[PDB]
């Protein structure tokens, strides 16, 4: 089987910024990949569409996926509120890496982050499951709207999202 590709169409204060697509590493982390894929299509009846990136830290990462509480305290997976860390085969090797946000071991929900740097201290703590394919320049533009503590200076939202091909 081929690794799925999904897309986010990102907006800044409601204005279209551009598309970011991701390869999901279903070959290495099928359960984690499937969660993100399904949340991106909205086929379960809930998911990423309309949600925001609530925490963007220049030189670190862009975090989103909290579609229930919109502030880092919420989100849920397609397997229940939380699921286990699938494995830590893949590492945070640099910009573009897509990884699961969490609040400790086995607390994966829907929140995710896109690295804008190598974040090796997170290896073995957060499950890496994909990488940016197209639109890294869009991620860089998003990153510039963040701050040291993550608060964004513009509303950064997922205006639309889905699966490609």
């Amino acid at each position: 089987m081929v690794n799925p590709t999904v897309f986010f169409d990102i907006a800044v204060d409601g204005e279209p910024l551009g598309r970011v697509s991701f390869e999901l590493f279903a070959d290495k982390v099928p359960k984690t990949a499937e969660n993100f894929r399904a949340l991106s299509t909205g086929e379960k009846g809930f998911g990423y569409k309309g949600s925001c990136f609530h925490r963007i830290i220049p030189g670190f990462m862009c975090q989103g996926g909290d579609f229930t509480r919109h502030n880092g305290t919420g989100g849920k997976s397609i397997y229940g509120e939380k699921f286990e860390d699938e494995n830590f085969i893949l590492k945070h090797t640099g910009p573009g890496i897509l990884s699961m946000a969490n609040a400790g071991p086995n607390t994966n929900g829907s929140q995710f982050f896109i690295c804008t740097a190598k974040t090796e201290w997170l290896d073995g703590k957060h499950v890496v499951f994909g990488k940016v394919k197209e639109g890294m320049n869009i991620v860089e533009a998003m990153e510039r709207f963040g701050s040291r503590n993550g608060k964004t200076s513009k509303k950064i939202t997922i205006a639309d999202c889905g699966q490609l091909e």
């Binding site: 925490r55 880092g72 989100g75």
Partner: protein
């Protein structure tokens, strides 16, 4: 020291103390010596050397490292109560505090211990009279 981790040996500890005693902690030659011996050091290893150094300039060097850690943490604040991580690299991690010697030699802290060696070299240079 990383090679497979091995603890700092008594031989090198004794040699470091001799260097500090005979020339001073912030003498250019001592700083150069620290620079060379710490190349393969974890942050825990670096702290071993700092900690065995007899208790004026020592306090000043420690204070300068403290100041660098404060400035780092201000620029890298952790997420608020109740909010999911990832947590940014924090200064106590960079300093290796609470890391097992083995843990400190692992891949998660490669860039961290490199930065720490730089903080200490800078602190030593900044306190040179």
């Amino acid at each position: 020291p990383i090679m497979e981790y091995e603890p700092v040996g008594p031989g090198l500890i004794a040699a470091w103390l001799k260097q500090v005693q005979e020339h001073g902690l912030t003498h250019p030659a001592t700083i150069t010596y620290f620079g060379v011996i710490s190349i393969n050091f974890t942050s825990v290893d670096i702290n071993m050397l700092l900690n065995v150094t007899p208790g004026a300039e020592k306090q000043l060097v420690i204070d300068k490292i403290k100041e660098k850690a404060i400035a780092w943490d201000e620029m890298h604040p952790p997420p608020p109560a109740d909010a999911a991580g990832p947590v940014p690299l924090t200064s106590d991690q960079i300093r290796g505090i609470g890391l097992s010697p083995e843990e400190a030699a692992g891949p998660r802290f490669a860039d961290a211990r490199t930065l720490y060696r730089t903080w200490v070299l800078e602190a030593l240079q900044e306190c040179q009279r």
